[PDB]
Design an enzyme around this catalytic site. Structure first.
Site, PDB file in Angstrom:
ATOM      1  CG  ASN A  46      31.142  92.895  51.262  1.00 32.92           C
ATOM      2  OD1 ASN A  46      31.911  92.245  50.589  1.00 32.92           O
ATOM      3  ND2 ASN A  46      29.599  93.066  50.056  1.00 32.92           N
ATOM      4  CB  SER A  50      35.145  92.901  53.230  1.00 29.67           C
ATOM      5  OG  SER A  50      33.573  92.911  52.824  1.00 29.67           O
ATOM      6  CG  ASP A  52      31.095  90.356  47.862  1.00 23.63           C
ATOM      7  OD1 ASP A  52      31.693  90.388  48.726  1.00 23.63           O
ATOM      8  OD2 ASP A  52      30.306  90.776  48.337  1.00 23.63           O
ATOM      9  CG  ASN A  59      34.171  89.363  51.477  1.00 26.24           C
ATOM     10  OD1 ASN A  59      34.930  89.196  52.495  1.00 26.24           O
ATOM     11  ND2 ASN A  59      33.160  90.587  51.740  1.00 26.24           N
ATOM     12  CG  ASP A 101      35.705  77.663  55.503  1.00 26.20           C
ATOM     13  OD1 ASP A 101      37.502  77.623  56.323  1.00 26.20           O
ATOM     14  OD2 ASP A 101      35.304  78.693  55.909  1.00 26.20           O
TER      15      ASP A 101
END
Length: 129
Positions: A46, A50, A52, A59, A101
């Protein structure tokens, strides 16, 4: 491993993803299709640095440790490499935490943009489940 559509649906079911947090199996299959094209080895960097990982493109910013995402967490308590295994257990366990989440499957941008609202049952059509 590159899963077949019905093969992945069976593994996801076996591992408790079917209607998990109210998301039908078709949703999960659809997400995997557009996230990884059913490839457990899929990785994608990304813009923020980061990465994935795996069939559900989990991620490293929040969820796994790759050692190269500064300031990141590892809320699934796993190396990101574990998310590339032919066995989907780590990816499924971590997906469950993610989908719990608060934003549901909107956590997966390809699910929101490509799956949400669609006839996701098509993804499990014909499968022996």
């Amino acid at each position: 491993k590159v899963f077949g559509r019905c093969e992945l649906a069976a593994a996801m079911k076996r591992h408790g993803l079917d209607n998990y947090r109210g998301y039908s199996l078709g949703n999960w299959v659809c997400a995997a299709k557009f996230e990884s094209n059913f490839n457990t080895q899929a990785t994608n960097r990304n813009t923020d640095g980061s990465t994935d990982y795996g069939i559900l493109q989990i991620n490293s910013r929040w969820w796994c440790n790759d050692g190269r995402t500064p300031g990141s967490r590892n809320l699934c308590n796993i190396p990101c490499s574990a998310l590339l295994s032919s066995d989907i257990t780590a990816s499924v366990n971590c997906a469950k935490k993610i989908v719990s989440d608060g934003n549901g499957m909107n956590a997966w941008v390809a699910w929101r943009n490509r799956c949400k609202g669609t006839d996701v049952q098509a993804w499990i059509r014909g499968c022996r489940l």
